[PDB]
Symmetry: D2
């Protein structure tokens, strides 16, 4: 009810920013070590600060640290506790530092660590997909455009689509990481300091490439948050497409995949209904990752220099986006490990819609017919085959009524198995082409037989 109370609750950040504690401690140790080296604090002050910070870290890891809203945020929580433990030397940690450059440093360190963790998770999902592909390497499914059957494809070729998507995501994560890995520490409030700090020393100690060249930039920049949010959002769109695909494959209309009981829900009344809830939720969680990105874009839009309290609002969306994408990645990996393909159902489905048509057109082109004539002939033959009706079941006599170009060899180009084997272009679904790409990924991901 007090104004001070209402403002305190509105402005407190510890409820969410306590997750930065490891990075805040690392940053404060590096700062103290540098201060001592530069003669701004004593070596005994450093010794006490380092030991006291390590004690606090241990207390937090053991869940014995009481986070307090009356201490506002992670930084003041940790520093007031340090003062309680070691006395007046703790008060020297503020020398030649502001909350403004401290928070920037801590957040960049947290984002760096979170990116490292995401990359491991992506590799794990890529491995899950490639292992699923190797286990189900011979299965043929329809390939779709406009959700219409277009050509036959190998199941491993489809799964490698998602592996390639995730590789571009990993690349964006690596590039983001490098760009963010510059140290804001030593910018102080915005202008730097006249005290004899060494910003190269703290940048090195904290694993940054070098110190940021402009103190105002250092305290005002949140591009690293934006870029990480965007990179999570693109990853999330890939997983939303995997979710759409697998929810469709789990339908009875498609009938291609059966999730295990452990990754689905059901009904006692309709025991055959198996709902793929985890992948629906993966699809749905792509939305909040997009919203998290919009939050911080809108937040930064039109802000003056240098530091503004508005930046407090960049933490929660980054934490949410990160937790969400990590979950989406890991659940998709578990789902991939807990699905079986319905081989008879798939086989029964493939004869519908003449997936061999393009192979037959390629046959005619190889025999010298122009592409348009080839397409016209094949469409007429398909037109003789409206029903169950299959091109490979037509007689040669029937084909010769349309063109003398057909010969007995045609049957090696018809049916869905021959069609897959006839694709030969780089990146194609041809069996040998897919075998080459599986080999690249078994090498790159260090997949073993064990």
């Amino acid at each position: 009810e007090s104004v001070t109370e209402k403002v305190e609750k509105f402005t407190e950040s510890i409820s969410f920013d306590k997750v930065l504690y490891k990075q805040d401690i690392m940053g404060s140790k590096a700062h103290a070590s540098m201060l001592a080296h530069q003669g701004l604090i004593t070596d005994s002050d450093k010794d006490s600060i380092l030991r006291g910070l390590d004690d606090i870290e241990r207390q937090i890891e053991a869940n014995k640290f009481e986070w307090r809203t009356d201490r506002e945020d992670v930084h003041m929580n940790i520093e007031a506790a340090l003062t309680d433990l070691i006395g007046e030397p703790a008060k020297k940690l503020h020398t030649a530092r502001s909350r403004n450059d401290q928070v920037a440093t801590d957040f960049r360190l947290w984002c760096r660590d979170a990116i490292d963790t995401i990359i491991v998770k992506i590799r794990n999902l890529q491995r899950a997909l490639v292992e699923l592909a190797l286990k189900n390497e011979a299965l043929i499914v329809p390939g779709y455009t406009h959700l219409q059957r277009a050509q036959p494809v190998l199941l491993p070729h489809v799964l490698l689509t998602f592996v390639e998507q995730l590789e571009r995501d990993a690349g964006r994560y690596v590039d983001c990481r490098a760009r963010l890995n510059f140290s804001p520490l030593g910018a102080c409030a915005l202008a730097g300091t006249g005290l004899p700090i060494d910003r190269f020393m703290t940048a090195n100690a904290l694993g940054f490439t070098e110190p940021m060249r402009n103190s105002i930039d250092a305290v005002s920049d949140r591009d690293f948050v934006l870029e990480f949010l965007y990179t999570n959002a693109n990853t999330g769109i890939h997983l939303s497409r995997l979710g759409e695909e697998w929810v469709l494959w789990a339908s009875e209309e498609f009938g291609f995949m059966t999730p295990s009981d452990s990754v689905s829900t059901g009904s006692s009344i309709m025991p055959q209904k198996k709902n793929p809830d985890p992948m629906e939720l993966v699809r749905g969680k792509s939305a909040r990752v997009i919203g998290d990105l919009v939050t911080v874009l809108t937040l930064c839009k039109g802000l003056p220099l240098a530091y503004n309290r508005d930046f407090q609002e960049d933490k929660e969306p980054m934490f949410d986006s990160t937790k969400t994408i990590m979950g989406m990645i890991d659940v998709s990996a578990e789902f991939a490990q807990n699905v079986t393909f319905n081989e008879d159902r798939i086989k029964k489905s493939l004869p519908a819609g003449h997936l061999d048509a393009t192979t037959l057109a390629d046959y005619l082109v190889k025999k010298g017919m122009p592409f348009r004539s080839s397409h016209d002939i094949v469409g007429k033959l398909v037109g003789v085959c409206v029903s169950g009706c299959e091109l490979q079941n037509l007689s040669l006599e029937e084909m010769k009524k349309l063109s003398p170009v057909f010969e007995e060899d045609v049957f090696g180009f018809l049916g869905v198995e021959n069609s897959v084997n006839k694709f030969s272009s780089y990146g194609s679904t041809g069996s040998n082409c897919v075998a080459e790409q599986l080999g690249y990924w078994v090498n790159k991901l260090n997949i073993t037989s064990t």
Copy 2:
């Protein structure tokens, strides 16, 4: 009477893309020439057929560049417009151009090439704006202005230091453009509809001919992927956020309340009855235009969310946002650079305002820490001294040494070299600080990096 449209005509109005995708013509022609050359090399068309296609496509490109080409809605899109015109020009050979190709791999190829060219043009414009900003900084290298937190004056800084903030922002933007360009520069051409082909094409030849690093390794990915669009959109949006902050800053500096900056008449609007009113419209519109760049990004994120594999017609909606985003960001960059070349700083107005905000307080606290006083005591002392100044109506540099010595013995006559705004600025010394020698180092770096003479 009123013409009565057919269903097909009503649908065609809704689905046509030529009204916007005509802007892909150069890339579409380059892609088709590369394809035809490959077809001939692989024996799929004759060398005669290839030569007819190449010369006909070059004629068509000349016609478009002359504004003598009639774009037709009844031909749907840029690809069919060009190829139907080619068939009208050369006849039968044109009909072999589409051998071992789909619109699905063609469109993806054409759009990547367009985005690659657009990124190259944006990086050039960014460097031009960085130069404009560095030149402004050099021209005004000695000017002191406040630095702000919470829109409250916090420390004194050099104007070149503030301007280099934007140069550093733009450098990260340029880095994002370079990284985006490299990731997009792989060729979808030869994925066909989605699965590849059994016809003997050469995807490495077309990739090389078109300046791509390599062919994409997955045909389904090649026709289904629009990450390059998303990444380019995001990179534009972040650039736009930087320019929106530049806009906010310069709209504030042009106010009478700040009074720091006067735009020229060529980059402002005014009032004949209020001749001192100078509205900084260009920078207001730069700030505003950041919004549509963010909207463009959201469009394509939302478009791709939840789509099944592989190619879907929804992807046609990826073009207009990318074109809008690109045209907007290029305008925003260029206009910001023109504004930077057409502003004057109001030196007397700035100077008169600086001395009364105790902006030297942190410098005095640094003095005390240098003389061996712990931080907390340094602040205690400085806060008390500023309190005396508020009482006396004076600046810290007006206090006697005797008065300071009433709170601490450490003060000596050298303290006066640490007080006042000019001396405060001079005392910043850390790397990346506003110190005059620090800033001079950074300006030297930028002058060399941008090849400024």
Copy 3:
């Protein structure tokens, strides 16, 4: 040149020329009020009104040259009016700013656009109701988690979308009423000391009343935000229609076949019918969301009162409106050009045991606890899966192995046709319930 680059960047006539009719109406009302208040003569007023009418006729005839060197729609019209009638044209500037003129014009444009959208929505609702009536007895699955859950009637499915669109029409009506207040007479932001009459112009332009605050009048764009949101939620509904119909057109579902006039195809696979209009409907919902985000972001953090940033409010509104009108209209065309495949659907239904919940309802009615009813029916479905039959093919004696409550009347609760007939709750898929709702909609849309 610098002036040239800035002129190109700041020009708005390339997009804002679409406000011409509203700009002219607003200037006519302004001139009429100036004469009524004695600030201009009736002769000057008459010259202005006739000149503006002449210009409107020129624009409608495609004989008016829009000029970038006259910046925007307002200066293009007024400079042309000066050329046409001379000094009286200049009197329009009396007691007016571009700040209040543009806000007035844009509200009028939005009001007219919303009126058009409501007409289009009703047309699409009729198209859906007509498709429902043509297929009123068709049973299809109802889905949860993209799994078959219950049997439903196709008209019940289509009425989902009609009810969605009714909410959208309601938002349009509410939005229109809230924007229908006049900003004209706010001038630059503070009003005027000249003896204008803002009640007269408000009435003349069909507004409910003048806005009560001049700063608000020039600084407000909520009508744009609300209209953009309303368009975005309508687009969401159409994106779900698009998803459903792209699924239904798939071979895997096989529920419907679009006509050749509303699909794209393949010489080589003449059965490959792509539903491109409905995919593009789905995809266009994205730009309508992005247009909303644009104007939200534009307004966020702006100081009062008028700022040049507001020039950016027009393009997104025009885009959003053009887009949603297109989506609505093409969805109606698609609805008129689809044929269901009853044979395929009907043959797919028996394996799904969609009558299971109806059998559970039978047992609940006979006094069995619901949880027990579900377990027992699930066991019977298991028996059916094992025997390869439907529930209706089990003997009564087989059911009695699980409970004595089953009696010969059970067979009237089994099979999909019986199941649909047994739904009876208000708003349910039951045949009579759906017939009631169709009757409601036929009357409400004046279908003959």
Copy 4:
């Protein structure tokens, strides 16, 4: 384990526990209808109602153990009910699904939250009107392009925000009415053949009527979308208040001083007063926009009818609602903890020639055309800029040199006080006009 990882990813209780009151209200109404309809005994119904009341008391006393192994609010409450009362609890779910239950509960929660927001909006409007009344005579500049344009009264500026919030309240009212339709009785998606009565439960729960389509009932989240948008537009307004007050708190403007209780500072720079609460109000508008985008994107392209994706619609709604309530309340506290720096404001006004437009009005009233009046005034203002004086310090002789229409009455139109007094159009900043609008708002808000 796998089961464990899925359980954690899919559990909703950590956030959806906040629906408990609505869940219990809905369940009691459902049980009451079941008993009236003969589906459960009256004794079973009485046991359920008493047990639900008991559980509500436990929750309100912080004695209820929420469990992730019971997934969500519905199962948490109902498994607890079964532990408390036994078998009768297991009849509660007769003729109901979680699909219609959750839609009902969320609508009720939204209806309550909207009611709470409207109260908080009215409180902020009163705070603003009270601030306006205390400072009713204060003149400040009005701005276009962040350049001083005309003199206005501080109450007129604050009434801008009150009018903005009135449109917000209108949107909240309209959104509440549209959401106030009952989905209960749609069951999984198709309704039921059990003899429920949906009108009875709609009545009991305060809904206008039952939703007319069961598939719509389980698949619709437009009420979330509309509530999220309405929060986002309110947040826009507050972000502009935030921008304005952070500017006014600057030393460059120097208009406003926040109290220590609503600001932060520096012990070494004791006149530095950071307006953190209003900066955070401005910044929190962003997450409200992001919450909207989340649910728009979630709904885009989703098939019918119920999908697990919808679990993601709660967190954004709860966040958006908590955020906007805080933004509203903190803005109201800030309004009660600011003082205007009257000498600083007064000293800044004369140099701007803010009376120029009032002088132009004077000349138009005396019969000069618009452009001539501006030509004359601009010349005079130029003279004053040279001489460093105000228009009101010019001699009538030197004015008459420029035009004979000037007379001694001109001085009553010069200077900022007279300029403000001379505005007369409805909604203008004129003293009498603003007094009228303040009176209107004092009555409307029941201020005593």
